[PDB]
Design an enzyme around this catalytic site. Structure first.
Site, PDB file in Angstrom:
ATOM      1  N   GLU C  71      43.905  61.731  81.078  1.00 23.04           N
ATOM      2  CA  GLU C  71      43.562  60.307  80.705  1.00 23.04           C
ATOM      3  C   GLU C  71      44.192  59.655  79.871  1.00 23.04           C
ATOM      4  O   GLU C  71      44.780  60.191  78.082  1.00 23.04           O
ATOM      5  CB  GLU C  71      42.266  59.967  80.709  1.00 23.04           C
ATOM      6  N   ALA C  99      39.101  65.651  82.870  1.00 25.62           N
ATOM      7  CA  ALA C  99      38.692  67.327  82.621  1.00 25.62           C
ATOM      8  C   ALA C  99      37.431  67.165  82.811  1.00 25.62           C
ATOM      9  O   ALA C  99      36.208  67.964  83.440  1.00 25.62           O
ATOM     10  CB  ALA C  99      39.107  67.999  82.457  1.00 25.62           C
ATOM     11  N   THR C 145      40.621  69.253  79.169  1.00 25.66           N
ATOM     12  CA  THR C 145      41.611  69.523  78.737  1.00 25.66           C
ATOM     13  C   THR C 145      42.209  70.424  78.067  1.00 25.66           C
ATOM     14  O   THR C 145      42.649  71.628  77.792  1.00 25.66           O
ATOM     15  CB  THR C 145      42.174  68.181  78.169  1.00 25.66           C
ATOM     16  N   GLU C 254      57.481  86.310  61.369  1.00 25.12           N
ATOM     17  CA  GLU C 254      56.897  87.017  60.174  1.00 25.12           C
ATOM     18  C   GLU C 254      55.487  86.353  59.855  1.00 25.12           C
ATOM     19  O   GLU C 254      54.340  87.010  59.254  1.00 25.12           O
ATOM     20  CB  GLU C 254      57.744  86.788  59.277  1.00 25.12           C
TER      21      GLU C 254
HETATM   22  N1  LIG Z   1      39.069  67.733  64.322  1.00 21.79           N
HETATM   23  C1  LIG Z   1      38.912  66.893  65.358  1.00 21.79           C
HETATM   24  N2  LIG Z   1      37.906  66.456  66.789  1.00 21.79           N
HETATM   25  C2  LIG Z   1      38.387  66.145  67.712  1.00 21.79           C
HETATM   26  C3  LIG Z   1      38.889  65.163  67.722  1.00 21.79           C
HETATM   27  N3  LIG Z   1      38.679  64.452  68.625  1.00 21.79           N
HETATM   28  C4  LIG Z   1      37.908  65.110  69.257  1.00 21.79           C
HETATM   29  N4  LIG Z   1      37.445  66.195  68.556  1.00 21.79           N
HETATM   30  C5  LIG Z   1      36.296  67.515  69.637  1.00 21.79           C
HETATM   31  O1  LIG Z   1      37.311  67.831  70.140  1.00 21.79           O
HETATM   32  C6  LIG Z   1      36.248  68.803  70.967  1.00 21.79           C
HETATM   33  C7  LIG Z   1      35.966  67.477  72.608  1.00 21.79           C
HETATM   34  O2  LIG Z   1      37.263  67.697  72.745  1.00 21.79           O
HETATM   35  P1  LIG Z   1      38.133  66.499  73.327  1.00 21.79           P
HETATM   36  O3  LIG Z   1      39.481  67.130  72.921  1.00 21.79           O
HETATM   37  O4  LIG Z   1      37.920  65.171  73.183  1.00 21.79           O
HETATM   38  O5  LIG Z   1      38.730  66.465  75.197  1.00 21.79           O
HETATM   39  P2  LIG Z   1      39.472  66.695  75.815  1.00 21.79           P
HETATM   40  O6  LIG Z   1      41.121  67.584  75.358  1.00 21.79           O
HETATM   41  O7  LIG Z   1      40.438  65.537  75.560  1.00 21.79           O
HETATM   42  O8  LIG Z   1      39.616  66.587  77.625  1.00 21.79           O
HETATM   43  P3  LIG Z   1      38.088  66.322  78.260  1.00 21.79           P
HETATM   44  O9  LIG Z   1      37.020  66.976  78.565  1.00 21.79           O
HETATM   45  O10 LIG Z   1      39.478  65.953  79.710  1.00 21.79           O
HETATM   46  O11 LIG Z   1      37.993  65.070  77.974  1.00 21.79           O
HETATM   47  C8  LIG Z   1      34.989  68.262  70.498  1.00 21.79           C
HETATM   48  O12 LIG Z   1      34.249  69.065  69.488  1.00 21.79           O
HETATM   49  C9  LIG Z   1      35.009  67.183  69.062  1.00 21.79           C
HETATM   50  O13 LIG Z   1      34.236  67.306  68.234  1.00 21.79           O
HETATM   51  C10 LIG Z   1      39.758  64.808  66.596  1.00 21.79           C
HETATM   52  O14 LIG Z   1      40.249  63.524  66.769  1.00 21.79           O
HETATM   53  N5  LIG Z   1      40.116  65.291  65.486  1.00 21.79           N
HETATM   54 MG   LIG Z   2      40.011  63.544  76.921  1.00 20.66          MG
END
Ligand SMILES: Nc1nc2c(ncn2[C@@H]2O[C@H](COP(=O)(O)OP(=O)(O)OP(=O)(O)O)[C@@H](O)[C@H]2O)c(=O)[nH]1
Ligand SMILES: [Mg+2]
Ligand SMILES: Nc1nc2c(ncn2[C@@H]2O[C@H](COP(=O)(O)OP(=O)(O)O)[C@@H](O)[C@H]2O)c(=O)[nH]1
Ligand SMILES: COc1ccc(/N=N/c2cc(OC)c(OC)c(OC)c2)cc1O
Ligand SMILES: [Ca+2]
Lengths: 424, 155, 437
Positions: C71, C99, C145, C254
């Site tokens: 998205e 997703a 995702t 490495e």
């Molecule tokens: N460290 C860190 N963790 C993040 C961040 N954004 C989301 N998370 C973590 O990632 C997990 C959620 O997955 P997302 O990366 O938001 O999901 P996505 O890949 O966008 O997949 P969708 O389900 O399609 O939205 C959770 O554990 C969140 O706490 C970020 O900017 N920094």
């Molecule tokens: Mg997302």
């Protein structure tokens, strides 16, 4: 994602639907004419979820209005925000349904269902990436219950990958002394278990009990009851309409809240309770888990939370909410299931509703909801054992076996709830 | 056979037809295949004046169908208050029991007709009466959390 | 000079990626428009920073990187941010519907609608390289995702780029800041399907990073922005050897040679010190011995576990700043007797040392004080098994009742994949046990 198409069907569906649109229009700076008068851009970022953009910078509600009774059409038009819906989106039959689920589902309502689908298709094709539908209705009448469930089924046939969500008002003898309403609601619940992703259970037994016993209103009206409904619907849809931090949509709600396909019936709850004319964070988080603040007439302390979502609205410390939610989750530990870790979710939204500085909204998937289904099951069975008025239904083509099957499905649902209450 | 016509007339609230049939010898206590009488149907469908004329012409106010239901059972279930009162004034057994063990009180409580509950108590309904599941009217009010009913039942 | 391509998948991967590339720019002297006044060779070059940045000919330095998300919301912030002019538009790729926190939606249905476009755009970046060594893949475990699409992508990259190395930076879920209840499911599913395809994976435990922001930085309620600036400091320290001159971890191969004794136990632990609040600007600086000791304190770890429990198989210490090699040797000599550090008997007890004599950069607006010296320790210790076990327990609790499983089965997944993924984690936990924990 983004866009939602709203259908409101029948008398209750249209009356509570109209209040929903008045309430969120005021929150989003939309006036009765449709023009934007707000003083904050936060009201416009996600306006596309519920409103389409027309020429001249005017926002028309993505809203479809259906009834077998034409008199409902004139009533909605005569309201303040009545001149904002698309006139092409009014779909009204000739003769109503007379509290007869079978007229809604099999005869009169079936004749009109193609015309409603035509406007649903038009509203759907003009969405960038539609995420799903919402439907408001009562289960106790003929149209919202009978024709609503029919419409749900045909939509789910044509849009099988989109989310179907309902706000479904359950009948109470305290508000409507009409004895066939257990029939109508049971026959509908049979359909809802199969054809909706998420159902908000709004119980007129709860609403009447709230007004009478707690709000001191000696003689509650539908206006009084719907004031409660309008606050609840505003609350539960808060994340869908404002940015916040929850990239909110209906499908993520379903994934996180529904661990088993049929147990998709939510108990909503709201704090503070208020009348139509007349708080600290620890007071909110306590009221939100109090049986008297539920919109379903059941006791959460009689069951177990599978999953819970909260939405705090107003200006407050993110830590104070996190700390208080922690507290409430420790004292009530034996009311959460222990095999779904991390099953309580908090959201916070800076923008509060009108007339409130801070509010809270509760959405719970609780096994305690079986008490509502048990109540309707007892009343259904009392009428059914004497076969009272059954010819009103079979005379429209219904087979009598459709009653026993709906009754068997509802007892199966109460059982399934009890199994995961007992589980360890 | 005028009994089948009285049965239909009593269900459909056709006062005139009821009087005419009775005058021509119709069996006021005829039964349909399930054992319902014209009084059963008049009480079921809320025809107060037909109830009263039937009771002035030899209707058995305590007739039961094959399920054990009396007219008072059906009036209390459907919620016809004025007919409940007429039935009691003409000798109905307030504590009659059907095949599910239900009394009229059980049915009025289950369906939430609170005025009828009060009327029946004031005529001697048995608060200890148990259905086949062991439940009394008070049990129903507790298992359903109906606080208005439970208050009523404590008098 | 051999090229590396970075791939950022999903919200976590995209947002951390944005933070990392900003810092990289500050480290190398690249402006937000891609201009680099210090590069004397215009339009080309073989300098070490060219592993991460190509050059156009008008003087622009451009990340070898692609951002992808199902998205548009998060990648739109890169398109309009401070470094919008840095990236090629065609290397920022979005769908219209995510997703929904569901591995199966990212892997099997929705993800299949965009995978070929993503592969073709990667191919274009790879075609510009004269000696591509492989890929750094940034993603959450928890997202639909980040979990589901990343395993689909990793499968395809192994077919289309069989000979190249693939490294992961993976965000491990924490209750404090998580998004979904099914994140334990997605974590195990993607771990299972990616394991054969990933040569080395650096796990970032959001709980660990959260606790460091609270303790060291005094941030009462850390947000994504605070976490990601901290994570970017650590990512930079890991990749600095790929971008600058040096004698340790000088190419992707490495990394594996040094840190991965056996292919499946390819999850090294990162520790980093010192973390000091930018409000303590005049703080007394810490010696090499002090910051080196700090790398064996569990609180400084990027993953929550207890290394004094497990056993070491590898240990590299990467220094940045005013660091005298004899002082490191004296530090290492002490931290071999006064601490409970046990290597496996089949591995040399040697610590590998690299020094970069430039101090680390801090981003303006960040939370960290400037330091004169800092160190990142990478180790392979059986103690990281504790991270998998906490995950496997949460999985098991819900899967025993089959909670939420229907959402995955409804998206084209077969329920047997659940049991096979959990069986793989059982085997992985036992892999750590045999070595010793
Ligand atoms: N460290 C860190 N963790 C993040 C961040 N954004 C989301 N998370 C973590 O990632 C997990 C959620 O997955 P997302 O990366 O938001 O999901 P996505 O890949 O966008 O997949 P969708 O389900 O399609 O939205 C959770 O554990 C969140 O706490 C970020 O900017 N920094
Ligand atoms: Mg997302
Ligand atoms: N809370 C609430 N309940 C309503 C409202 N209107 C009708 N009902 C309830 O809805 C049921 C009757 O259904 P109704 O919508 O009137 O029938 P329909 O027009 O065929 O869909 C009864 O339980 C009523 O008490 C309303 O505005 N608010
Ligand atoms: C059991 O654990 C959980 C429970 C609920 C959770 N998410 N609740 C919401 C998510 C929403 O959209 C993303 C949303 O916007 C529609 C919403 O508004 C009501 C709530 C997340 C969980 O991890
Ligand atoms: Ca150059």
């Amino acid at each position: 994602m983004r866009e939602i198409v709203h259908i409101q069907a029948g008398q209750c569906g249209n009356q509570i639907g109209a209040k929903f649109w008045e309430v969120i229009s005021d929150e989003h700076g939309i006036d009765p004419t449709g023009s934007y008068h707000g003083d904050s851009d936060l009201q416009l970022e996600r306006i596309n979820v519920y409103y389409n953009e027309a020429t001249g910078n005017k926002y028309v509600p993505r809203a479809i209005l259906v009834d077998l009774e034409p008199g409902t059409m004139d009533s909605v038009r005569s309201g303040p925000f009545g001149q904002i819906f698309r006139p092409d989106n009014f779909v009204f039959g000739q003769s109503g349904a007379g509290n007869n689920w079978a007229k809604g589902h099999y005869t009169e309502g079936a004749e009109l269902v193609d015309s409603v689908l035509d406007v649903v298709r038009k509203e759907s094709e003009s969405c960038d990436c539609l995420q799903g539908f919402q439907l408001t209705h009562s289960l106790g009448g003929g149209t919202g219950s009978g024709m609503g469930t029919l419409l749900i089924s045909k939509i789910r046939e044509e849009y099988p990958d989109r989310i179907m969500n309902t706000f479904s008002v359950m009948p109470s003898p305290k508000v409507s002394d009409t004895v066939v309403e257990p029939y109508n609601a049971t026959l509908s619940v049979h359909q809802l278990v199969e054809n909706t992703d998420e159902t908000y259970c709004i119980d007129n037994e709860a609403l009447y009990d709230i007004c009478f016993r707690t709000l001191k209103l000696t003689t509650p009206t539908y206006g009084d009851l719907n004031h409660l409904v309008s606050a609840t619907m505003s609350g539960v849809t808060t994340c869908l309409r404002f940015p916040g931090q929850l990239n909110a949509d209906l499908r993520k709600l379903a994934v996180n809240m529904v661990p088993f396909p049929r147990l998709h019936f939510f108990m909503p709850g709201f704090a503070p309770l208020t009348s139509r004319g007349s708080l600290t964070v620890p007071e909110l988080t306590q009221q939100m888990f109090d049986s008297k603040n539920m919109m379903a007439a059941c006791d959460p302390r009689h069951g177990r939370y599978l999953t819970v979502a909260a939405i705090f609205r107003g200006r407050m410390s993110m830590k104070e909410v996190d700390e208080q939610m922690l507290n409430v989750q420790n004292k009530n530990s034996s009311y959460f299931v222990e095999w779904i870790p991390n099953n309580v979710k908090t959201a916070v939204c800076d923008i509060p509703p009108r007339g409130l500085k801070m509010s809270a909204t509760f959405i719970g998937n609780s096994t305690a909801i079986q008490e509502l289904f048990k109540r309707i099951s007892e009343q259904f069975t009392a009428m059914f054992r004497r076969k009272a008025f059954l010819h009103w239904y079979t005379g429209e083509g219904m087979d009598e076996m459709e009653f026993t099957e709906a009754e068997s499905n509802m007892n199966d649902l109460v059982s399934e709830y009890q199994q995961y209450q007992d589980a360890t | 056979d005028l009994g089948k016509k009285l049965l239909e007339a009593a269900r459909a609230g056709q006062d005139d037809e009821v009087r005419i049939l009775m005058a021509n010898g119709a069996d006021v206590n005829a039964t349909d295949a399930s054992g319902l009488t014209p009084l059963h149907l008049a009480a079921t469908y809320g025809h107060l004046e037909i109830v009263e004329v039937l009771l002035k012409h030899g209707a058995d106010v305590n007739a039961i169908d094959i399920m054990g239901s009396t007219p008072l059972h059906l009036a209390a279930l459907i919620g016809h208050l004025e007919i409940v009162e007429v039935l009691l004034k003409h000798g109905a057994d307030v504590n009659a029991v059907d095949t599910w063990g239900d009394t009229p009180l059980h049915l009025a409580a289950i369906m939430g007709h609170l005025e009828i509950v009060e009327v029946l108590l004031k005529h001697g309904a048995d608060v200890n009466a148990q259905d086949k599941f062991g439940k009394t009217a008070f049990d129903i009010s507790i298992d359903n959390g109906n606080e208005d009913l439970a208050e009523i039942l404590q008098k | 000079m051999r090229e590396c391509i970075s791939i950022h998948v999903g919200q976590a991967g995209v947002q951390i990626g944005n933070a990392c590339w900003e810092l990289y720019c500050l480290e190398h002297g690249i402006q937000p428009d891609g201009q680099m006044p210090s590069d004397k060779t215009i339009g080309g070059g073989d300098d070490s920073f060219n592993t991460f940045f190509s050059e156009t000919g008008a003087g622009k330095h451009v990340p070898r990187a692609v951002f992808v998300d199902l998205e548009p919301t998060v990648i739109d912030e890169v398109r309009t941010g401070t470094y919008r002019q840095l990236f090629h538009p065609e290397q920022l790729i979005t769908g219209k519907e995510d997703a929904a926190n569901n591995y199966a939606r990212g892997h099997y249905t929705i993800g299949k609608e965009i995978i070929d476009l993503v592969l073709d755009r990667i191919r274009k970046l790879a075609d510009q390289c004269t000696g591509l060594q492989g890929f750094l893949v940034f993603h959450s475990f928890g997202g639909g995702t980040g979990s589901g699409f990343t395993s689909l992508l990793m499968e395809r990259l192994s077919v289309d780029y069989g000979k190249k190395s693939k490294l992961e930076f993976s965000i491990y879920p924490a209750p404090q800041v998580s998004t979904a209840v099914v994140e334990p499911y997605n974590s195990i599913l993607t771990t299972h399907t990616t394991l054969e395809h990933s040569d080395c994976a650096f796990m970032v435990d959001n709980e660990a990073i959260y606790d460091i922001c609270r303790r060291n930085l005094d941030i009462e309620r850390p947000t994504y922005t605070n976490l990601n600036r901290l994570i970017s400091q650590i990512v930079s320290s890991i990749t600095a050897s790929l971008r600058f001159d040096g004698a340790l971890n000088v190419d992707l191969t490495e990394f594996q040679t040094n840190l991965v004794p056996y292919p499946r136990i390819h999850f090294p632990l990162a520790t980093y010190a010192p973390v000091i609040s930018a409000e303590k600007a005049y703080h007394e600086q810490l010696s090499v011995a002090e910051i080196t000791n700090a790398c064996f304190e569990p609180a400084n770890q990027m993953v929550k576990c207890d290394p004094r429990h497990g056993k070491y198989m590898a240990c590299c210490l990467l220094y940045r700043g005013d660091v005298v090699p004899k002082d490191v040797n004296a530090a290492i000599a002490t931290i071999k007797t006064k601490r409970s550090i046990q290597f496996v008997d089949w591995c040399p007890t040697g610590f590998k040392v690299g020094i970069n004599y430039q101090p680390p950069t801090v981003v303006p607006g960040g939370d960290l004080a400037k330091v004169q010296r800092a160190v990142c320790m990478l180790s392979n210790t059986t103690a990281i098994a504790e991270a998998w076990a906490r995950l496997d327990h949460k999985f098991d609790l819900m899967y025993a009742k089959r909670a939420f499983v229907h959402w995955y089965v409804g998206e084209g997944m077969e329920e047997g994949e659940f049991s096979e993924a959990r069986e793989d984690m059982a085997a992985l936990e036992k892999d750590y046990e045999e070595v010793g924990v």
